[PDB]
Design a binder for this molecule. Structure first.
Ligand SMILES: [Mn+2]
Length: 738
RNA sequence: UUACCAUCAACAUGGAAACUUGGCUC
RNA sequence: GAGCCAAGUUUCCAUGUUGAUGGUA
């Protein structure tokens, strides 16, 4: 196993006797802080300890059903009436009590002089300020109380908040200091697209438009029905005095249709959130940023321990915790994971087991691949700017062709007179028109060019179906960084040409491993990519996408079963399904609706009635793991499984760290088995997941997700932004999308 | 677009609970 | 009074994607 530390962060044991009230303010105050001040002033009637969210409140004592209080606003001496209802009891301290738990612990963070930014709390006393880009990088913790199989935990990981130490108003002031002619247009271009955050209610808004005619001295109407000015609004509610009465106003017109009336924002107390573009190019600034932000497991655990010491040091936060019956542990939680054995990577004439690094970038380019096709009559499309460089590749391509036992002829020498996209398209079309037996088509470009990749995959997956390869000069012009890159280039070449690269021994007989990916960037239509194994060694993968109603994946399953029929000759046995991640709260929509809708598609086939295991694969995980080495906390070894205590209560799931981590702490991947009709054991199912983590052929090593999952992700990525079309059926038997 | 991995920044979606609004039904 | 549906607000979150900067081959 692995004696890791941390896992889900320390146990936070709680208490009972909560009561849920809905405080109505007449007139309604729109400020959380001043409403909290009124309900702390009224502690004679509402009791010593209150948990207030802004509109919904929690007390440890049962009041009466209707409570009317006469409070005074601390700004204009406005006599307002507080209307305390009595809604819920919340006796058993179930999942219903979790938002109240997060409310009291968020105030526990708040009165430690930690600012609330986004969903997290950050410490300004730990300031790391860069005056070169006038910003502060000040750290904090992303705290949230959750419930898992081990019980009630508080998850907090080290989040660093990039606060530009200059308001949005100060940003336009600085721009006006720089440019005083076209200040408005460039300020609008900078602000639109990246958000601002209002710090009086920590709320983030996208700058849809900026109104320079609108002024805070002008008056607007609330949703309640009162005509008030912005100086008056902020002064009576939030207590903010507007310094400069000539600001613009930021409008955040929301998405779809009151809801979509408008939202108006003041630049004075809204701040920028993003990394400056001047900071990105600066090598020393980014060196400081990624030396102080990618914390080691030692530094991450030390920051969490410093948070624990700060909480135990301040008497007010601890007093709040015990007066609400909460308690934080002395240190973080300690359980043990499990290290899976390394899997033997198989080639033609030999196979090798792997060491702790789980990388085979040098163990591959000594032995021949299991099936490489006789690569002949291929072409190389290059421009003259990479001329000599490109010639070198061809030479070392032969110097790699021998080691991996793959026969390569001198290709076509095709020139690209210009780097235009349609020039590439027409020269590949001319090459395919002249000779119809061209196997592979490879182009070379300058810089990250997404539209060239789009049209190359357009032509080589839709119009004229041929395997293709795209090469960039950002890396290929490096002398010492060339051999290990050309190795992976030739491996991808053999992969997309239909030749089977390295395999892993799959211990399950006659299975159809399926991965799907629902790609929806907004714009473009949502597309489900679908990759299904059609062999016993799982080396060739059938592919198909659909365009969406998401339950109707149409003929994907029956086409996969038809090609498995045509290849394996009337012996289908098993189906293993790997779906993309969905919010918890979309697991039932996946579980009890979509799967016993696609399981009825098997009736189209002649009385099959198969087995089926459906996963939900969740990748972005804010839970961190550190190995508790006898000196300190180090990076966990690849192949680590946490199948308990940090997983969901309702379902069967596990977290797998299946990759080499050199920077910071790794992200384990969450796999939730929503269907297990084939009666897979957890050990066999996660070993199959790790086996497919080995199976990804575009990286000579293991990855965090299974190979069909990343195959479907690349395929749906293609059909979303790179194709906008179903791929041609000729290439669907190959891994053309790598 | 040779890849993989970290960490920041950001959007969209969904769940749950209160309140409000509008509809049907005892 | 009372059950259900739809939408919005406020709290809590959850997941996916995007861009960026690094590390390594
Ligand atoms: Mn995906």
């Amino acid at each position: 196993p692995q004696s890791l530390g941390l896992n889900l962060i320390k146990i936070q044991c709680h208490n009972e006797a909560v009561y849920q009230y809905h405080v109505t303010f007449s007139p309604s105050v729109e400020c959380k802080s001043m409403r909290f001040g009124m309900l702390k002033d009224h502690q004679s009637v509402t009791g010593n300890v209150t948990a207030f969210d802004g509109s919904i409140l929690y007390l440890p004592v049962k009041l009466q059903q209707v409570v009317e209080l006469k409070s005074q606003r601390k700004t204009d001496d406005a006599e307002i009436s507080i209307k305390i209802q009595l809604t819920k009891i919340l006796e058993p301290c179930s999942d219903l009590c979790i938002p109240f738990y997060n409310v009291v612990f968020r105030r526990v963070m708040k009165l430690l002089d930690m600012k609330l930014v986004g969903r997290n709390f950050y410490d300004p006393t730990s300031a790391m300020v860069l005056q070169q880009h006038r910003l502060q990088i000040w750290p904090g913790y992303a705290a949230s109380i959750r419930r898992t199989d081990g019980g009630l935990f508080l998850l907090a990981d080290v989040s660093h908040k990039v606060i530009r130490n200059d308001s949005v108003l100060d940003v336009m002031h600085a721009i006006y200091q720089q440019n005083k002619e076209h200040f408005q247009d460039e300020c609008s271009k900078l602000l639109v697209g990246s958000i601002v955050i209002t710090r009086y209610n920590n709320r983030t808004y996208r700058i849809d438009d900026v109104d320079w005619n609108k002024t805070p001295k002008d008056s607007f109407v609330m949703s309640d029905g009162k005509e008030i000015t912005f100086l008056e609004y902020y002064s009576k509610n939030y207590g903010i005095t507007v310094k400069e009465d000539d600001q613009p106003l930021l409008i955040h017109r929301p998405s779809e249709r009151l809801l979509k009336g408008e939202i108006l924002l003041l630049p004075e107390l809204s701040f920028m959130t993003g990394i400056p573009e001047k900071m990105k190019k600066d090598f020393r600034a980014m060196k400081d940023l990624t030396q102080q932000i990618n914390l080691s497991p030692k530094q991450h655990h030390g920051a969490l321990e410093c948070l624990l010491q700060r909480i135990s040091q301040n008497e007010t936060a601890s007093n709040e915790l015990t007066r609400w019956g909460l308690s934080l542990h002395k240190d973080v939680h300690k359980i043990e994971g499990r290290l899976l054995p390394m899997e033997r990577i198989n080639l033609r004439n030999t196979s090798f087991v792997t060491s702790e690094d789980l990388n085979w970038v040098k163990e591959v380019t000594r032995d021949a691949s299991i099936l490489t096709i006789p690569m002949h009559f291929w072409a190389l499309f290059y421009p003259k700017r990479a001329m000599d460089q490109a010639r070198e590749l061809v030479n070392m391509l032969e110097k790699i062709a021998g080691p991996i036992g793959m026969r390569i002829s001198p290709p076509a020498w095709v020139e690209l007179k210009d780097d235009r996209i349609e020039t590439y398209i027409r020269t590949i079309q001319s090459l395919l028109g002249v000779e119809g037996k061209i196997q592979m088509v490879v182009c070379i470009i300058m810089g990250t060019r997404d539209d060239l990749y789009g049209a190359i995959k357009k032509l080589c997956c839709v119009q004229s179906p041929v395997p293709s390869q795209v090469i960039n000069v950002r890396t290929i012009g490096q002398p010492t960084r060339l051999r290990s890159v050309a190795q992976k280039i030739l491996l991808q070449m053999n992969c997309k040409l239909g030749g089977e690269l390295w395999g892993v021994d799959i211990p399950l007989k006659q299975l159809m491993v399926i991965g799907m990916d629902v790609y929806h960037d907004p714009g473009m239509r949502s597309v489900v990519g679908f990759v299904a194994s059609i062999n016993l060694t799982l080396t060739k993968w059938y592919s198909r996408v659909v365009f969406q109603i998401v339950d109707s994946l149409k003929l994907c399953l029956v086409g996969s079963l038809k090609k498995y029929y045509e290849v394996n000759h009337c012996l289908p046995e098993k189906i293993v399904v790997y779906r993309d991640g969905v919010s918890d709260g979309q697991l039932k929509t996946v579980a009890n609706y979509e799967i016993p809708q696609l399981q009825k598609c098997f009736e189209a086939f002649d009385n099959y009635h198969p087995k089926m295991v459906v996963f939900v694969v969740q990748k972005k995980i804010s839970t961190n793991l550190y190995l508790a080495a006898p000196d300190h906390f180090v990076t966990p070894s690849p192949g680590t499984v946490v199948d308990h205590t940090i997983t969901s209560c309702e379902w069967v799931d596990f977290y797998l760290l299946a990759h080499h981590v050199r920077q910071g702490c790794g992200i384990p991947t969450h796999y939730i088995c929503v269907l297990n009709t084939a009666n897979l054991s957890p050990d066999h199912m996660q070993r199959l997941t790790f086996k497919l983590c080995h199976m990804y052929w575009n990286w000579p090593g293991t990855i965090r997700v299974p190979a069909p999952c990343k195959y479907a992700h690349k395929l749906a990525f293609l059909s979303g932004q790179i194709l906008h079309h179903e791929p041609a059926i000729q290439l669907c038997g190959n891994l053309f999308f790598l």
